[PDB]
């Protein structure tokens, strides 16, 4: 079980948002905290992806590309499992110091998106998603979105991706499970995209609403996210 050992070995631990939970729940406070959490989680995603089997074969620019594109989806997917395990999908467990209840969902101004995410969090339950299936679905999420006119070494990418699907095959060992898990991974992408849209817009209007973006995230949002939004970069979907 050499592959599965690695995934669990490299799984990130708890990341806090640094939230001030004595502050009354203002939109700006919440989103200035979500953004900081973004960056914290990004850092942990960089460390993880590097210790990822084969990841290092990718040309370096593809590594950076691929992480920036997937970031949201990874954050979203993991968050849904965290929320499931920790609080049984009652609330959104972004971090320990940052759990969204219905009021916070309304307050963030991303209620529709949140309900989507809460729903997915329930799915880890409705499907009895093993922790081994989750870990491996989450790896496959990093290979689930690419610029349409391809990466620098697209072939080394396609190998890696088709090999992460072989691993999921073994974690499923039965044809019917694959239907559902692949359906579950597709659900992430619409959500990632709504988040991406919201986030992007927020950056533009951010000086007028007092929301605070860490340098690195503002750059990513202004440089990579537009490509997703402009259709240059597109998720790989199993279905439809």
């Amino acid at each position: 079980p050499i592959f599965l050992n690695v995934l669990e070995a490299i799984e990130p631990g708890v990341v806090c948002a640094g939230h001030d939970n004595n502050q009354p729940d203002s939109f700006a406070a919440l989103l200035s905290s979500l953004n900081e959490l973004g960056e914290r989680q990004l850092v942990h995603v960089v460390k993880w992806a590097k210790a990822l089997p084969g990841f290092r074969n990718l040309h370096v620019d593809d590594q950076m590309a691929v992480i920036q594109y997937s970031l949201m989806g990874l954050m979203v997917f993991a968050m849904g499992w965290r929320s499931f395990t920790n609080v049984n999908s009652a609330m959104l467990y972004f971090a320990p110091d940052l759990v969204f209840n219905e009021y916070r969902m309304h307050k963030s101004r991303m209620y529709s998106q949140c309900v989507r995410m809460r729903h997915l969090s329930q799915e880890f339950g409705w499907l009895q998603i093993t922790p081994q299936e989750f870990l491996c679905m989450k790896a496959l999420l990093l290979f689930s979105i690419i610029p349409v006119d391809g990466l620098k070494n697209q072939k080394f990418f396609d190998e890696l991706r088709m090999n992460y699907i072989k691993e999921l095959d073994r974690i499923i060992a039965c044809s019917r499970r694959f239907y559902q898990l692949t359906k579950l991974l597709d659900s992430v992408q619409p959500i990632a995209r709504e988040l991406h849209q919201f986030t992007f817009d927020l950056l533009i209007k951010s000086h007028m609403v007092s929301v605070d973006f860490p340098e690195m995230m503002a750059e990513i949002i202004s440089v990579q996210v537009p490509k997703i939004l402009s259709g240059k970069v597109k998720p790989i979907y199993f279905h439809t």
């Binding site: 960089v46 370096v60 590594q63 950076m64 992480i67 920036q68 340098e215 690195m216 750059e219 990513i220 440089v223």
Partner: peptide, 9 residues
């Protein structure tokens, strides 16, 4: 890019 310099250090 600040992500580039961070990514490779």
């Amino acid at each position: 890019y600040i992500f580039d310099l961070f990514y490779k250090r």
